[PDB]
Amino acid sequence: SNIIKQLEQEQMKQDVPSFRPGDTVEVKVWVVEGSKKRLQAFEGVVIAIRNRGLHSAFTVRKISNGEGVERVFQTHSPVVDSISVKRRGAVRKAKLYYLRERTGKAARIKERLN
Amino acid sequence: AVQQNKPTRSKRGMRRSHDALTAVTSLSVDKTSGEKHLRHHITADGYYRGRKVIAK
Amino acid sequence: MIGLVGKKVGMTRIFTEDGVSIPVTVIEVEANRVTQVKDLANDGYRAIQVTTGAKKANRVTKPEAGHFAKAGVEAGRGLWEFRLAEGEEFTVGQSISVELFADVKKVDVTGTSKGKGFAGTVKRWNFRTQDATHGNSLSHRVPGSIGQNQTPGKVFKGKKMAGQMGNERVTVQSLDVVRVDAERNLLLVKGAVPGATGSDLIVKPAVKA
Amino acid sequence: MIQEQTMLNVADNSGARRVMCIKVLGGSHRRYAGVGDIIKITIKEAIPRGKVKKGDVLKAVVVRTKKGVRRPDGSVIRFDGNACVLLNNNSEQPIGTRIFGPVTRELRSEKFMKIISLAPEVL
Amino acid sequence: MRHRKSGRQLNRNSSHRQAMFRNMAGSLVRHEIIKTTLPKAKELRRVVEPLITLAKTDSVANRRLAFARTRDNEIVAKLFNELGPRFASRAGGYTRILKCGFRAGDNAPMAYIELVDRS
RNA sequence: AGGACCGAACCGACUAAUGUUGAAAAAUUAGCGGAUGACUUGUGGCUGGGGGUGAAAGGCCAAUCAAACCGGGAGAUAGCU
RNA sequence: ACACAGGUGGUCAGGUAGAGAAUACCAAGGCGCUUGAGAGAACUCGGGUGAAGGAACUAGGCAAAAUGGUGCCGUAACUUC
RNA sequence: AAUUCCUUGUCGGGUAAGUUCCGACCUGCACGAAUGGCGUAAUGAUGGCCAGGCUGUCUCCACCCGAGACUCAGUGAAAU
RNA sequence: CGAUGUCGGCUCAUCACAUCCUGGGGCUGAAGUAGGUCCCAAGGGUAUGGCUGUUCGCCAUUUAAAGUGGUACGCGAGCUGGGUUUAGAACGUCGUGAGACAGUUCGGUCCCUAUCUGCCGUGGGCGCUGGAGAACUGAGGGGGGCUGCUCCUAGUACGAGAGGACCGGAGUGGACGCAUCACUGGUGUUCGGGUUGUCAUGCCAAUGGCACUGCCCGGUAGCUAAAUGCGGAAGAGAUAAGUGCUGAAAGCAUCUAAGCACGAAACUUGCCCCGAGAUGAGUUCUCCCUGACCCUUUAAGGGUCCUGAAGGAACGUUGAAGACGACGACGUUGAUAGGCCGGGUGUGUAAGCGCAGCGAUGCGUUGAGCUAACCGGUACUAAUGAACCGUGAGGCUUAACCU
């Protein structure tokens, strides 16, 4: 509907970089602890992207301290302060859930050049 | 599972109270061929809303 | 205090700068415009009948058309009454905007919930299903026992059974008003309201508050 | 989203490798424990010389779930597995002195600030 | 329930529906008018008209798509050589449903579905 | 080599669901056992009712078995309904 | 008893894959099973998928799920070897 | 104990918890030596118990695909 | 006894109150905390497991609590079939034996398409006094009603300390319920792709069929819970036990006899839903119909002609409505459905061609191609001019007004 679309449009971010599944991204999120806002980085492989305008989201998978950690960011959330693409990854799928059963060398994804 | 008394012809008629058929309210007349037909259906000659729609 | 008749437009989120995503139902509230004012003398109670939206002239019948003409107002898509509180006055032709809710913090939203058709006891009443295995013969979602033996020798009224679920009037209470946008005729309330997209909604200032 | 019979990994160094939730605490008929929730556990697997022993019945705080936690913006943080920190039955203080793997902000509360401080990373 | 769902089951499985609608689309392209049950004609609109839309622009890829959807080379040929050009200016709605009573055998409500520019 | 192994045909029939006025007076479907043997199977034959036959369950002996069926004694008898 | 999902001995034995007469898809050949049309509720039947958990179900892991091939490496107690 | 009533004997193991299981004890109600005793590899659509894997068995059900059920047309039962 | 199917479990309950929790209160050998006991109170709530066929019980760990009972010790034309209670077999025991056992053990067919009552839903008829379209009122009915913890009050009152409140306020939970799909997910045999075997499209290439959707990987809409919103209340009235005031009988005393007050999750309301068949059939607003003559058994009579309204129905396109009816939208003066156009979404760089490579294949064209149910538009197709039903001013008697 036009009304809902306008409501979401006047709210969407205008600066979201173009990334793809298999890209390594650093997402800088706002962490409020105490009375002070700091900026915490979460870096990992984009294993899934949901494009729904304002309701767009993307899932980033990392291995921190031995444990596998997936985080679904709402792209247009003000909590997500920035997104940067560190590595540009070559995959053929839209959603890389097969990386959940992979570690180390098996979990490597090659870089798409050009 | 099964009846414990035989229901009456009265009860049977009261059940069949809703079994009546409804006549078609009114037939249309094709404006060209002039023959009756159901609303929104072609005539038996192959007419619908005037034009000949199927060759016989 | 009186409510308005809006339409359910859909659901979305409102991001707060603080970082919260508020799920909101968007309700378009076009100008509710009064048709009849009821009072103790003629009707025995105080209420305003309002209409909203528009209707095809070729589907506004002459009784409806004459009612609207007496009100001196354009035909809407329906007619809804709101009971008036003490010392609350409206004239026959007033248009009531969504601006009415500019102050109120919580509203009650009444709608017609989505109709689920004929629902089994599992869906309709949250009945526990019986064993899917372990010998169960043909009795996986059936309601089990429905009474007792020879005393009372009947099934009680109000027994939870299969039947029509939904497609009924449902009021959800104390929804927080997130935004009143009188310019675009929007009322954004936090959370879900009854009904499908594009269905009619009654929005009142919350009775409990 | 942890229930009875759920096996959790142990995010501390108390000695246990695997524990089983035998009770979700804090309410009648309570089904699941998320992150930050206290559960009763029995130790199923432990290292030979640790603070805790196999078959011990004690408490634990769930710190990572594979179901994940929602944040106010609608984001979710999931983990590859379920993990808890063993706690003393009475004090409900962690038994170990070291927290392994990341934890989350839902632990940021005076009950588990020691866990938060000892944790290597807090999502 | 069935809220906002599209496509008639027609008391068949999915593979049967797909095969039957291939046969019926081929019949309709071949004969330009067929008699079939009214629900099948309504469902056939959504199979046949996309084929004509596809055939309006002739390319090898569009020929091959039409051949995947119809599996009949002479049907593809008729589409792309006759009905594409015949319907080039028509913005959709290439077929017409004409209700024609009921079958004797089962009292099924019948209908003719024909190409609009047949007569 | 083998009363050997896995496994079709073939022979059986452990579990389950369905079916239970069945498609069927015992089956279907999914699994299941044996599958060169004390195997299975066709044709023909023999054993006859207090008798047969029985790797034995009172099993089976024409959908009938702690005494087959058919006819007869016979309208047994029935202090029972 | 039926134009009945049962039973009925023998012979023939194509292609591709396959160990195969398994199985899959086909050939020759033969069929679509003698009510259809719609709809797309509960519920029943037969199936598919399923977050997190994983036998907490239950009399019982019943049923499901799972395992599953070939080559090779490797293989415990016990043993009548 | 396919045997034990008392009895869920007692002790040990397994479990968080074990009337079942396993190992013992001997107080064998009422084992016992070819109506065999006690062992026993292998075997078993055999009984009991435990574990790994696996899972809608379950927490707790959801959706989907088909055959019915529902409506129309034709035929047209049954127990009672 | 020409059959009333047993235990337990499951499912689904319903009532009682001799109340387990929560609520109110008296006494206490009640300092506080925590108790003990009794009274009132049935609104709501009132464990999961291990063992066993169990009920029970014991145990483990919860909980505010894990109530007691009735309901054919509720519930097998609802399920199970472990126990029990057929036929097989064995052990102990008894018996010469056949066999047997308030012993044990292994195995062992649970039928019924609902006529009536009932109940859950959903329609058709007529009624409601001219007809019709709406909006109501609210007699009545139903739903709901649970509770933890933390913080503040306040380390205050109380207490020698140890400990540690009432009342009041705030927050956050569990269970339950309603709604919803924005999110997170599931599903998504109608979308995209990968891939095995095989057959076919003459062949290559590219596709299609079949193999559980062949096997998979994703996934739109819808539907969904595990997802996220909301709810239980506050308030009022009359009370329970109980506490009183004033106060005689009975010069005092006395909560009572007259009078007056307070008093609880119980009751009546307040919240939500149904609801005028509420036959006591209600109200309000609007709309429509303003013609002729015959008739005799003369009256709420029948007839014929003319007339056919408001509206309804029917039909069609249909719906986030639905078993069917119903209900909603729309029918050319039209976006109702399909198609079409644009977008979105999903999948993931089609085909063809070119280049590189011996080739598999890669690269480029190319985030390409395709894309359901979605969004925004678009009369291209289909929603027909009609016809049909429904009438023509609406009884009697009284009363009050109007002339």
Ligand SMILES: [Mg+2]
């Ligand atoms: Mg009788």
Ligand SMILES: [Mg+2]
């Ligand atoms: Mg009928």
Ligand SMILES: [Mg+2]
């Ligand atoms: Mg519906």
Ligand SMILES: [Mg+2]
């Ligand atoms: Mg259950």
Ligand SMILES: [Mg+2]
């Ligand atoms: Mg059965």
Ligand SMILES: [Mg+2]
């Ligand atoms: Mg079943």
Ligand SMILES: [Mg+2]
């Ligand atoms: Mg649709």
Ligand SMILES: [Mg+2]
């Ligand atoms: Mg059919």
Ligand SMILES: [Mg+2]
């Ligand atoms: Mg297929």
Ligand SMILES: [Mg+2]
């Ligand atoms: Mg052999």
Ligand SMILES: [Mg+2]
């Ligand atoms: Mg045999």
Ligand SMILES: [Mg+2]
């Ligand atoms: Mg078989």
Ligand SMILES: [Mg+2]
């Ligand atoms: Mg074999």
Ligand SMILES: [Mg+2]
């Ligand atoms: Mg004899």
Ligand SMILES: [Mg+2]
């Ligand atoms: Mg015997």
Ligand SMILES: [Mg+2]
């Ligand atoms: Mg026999």
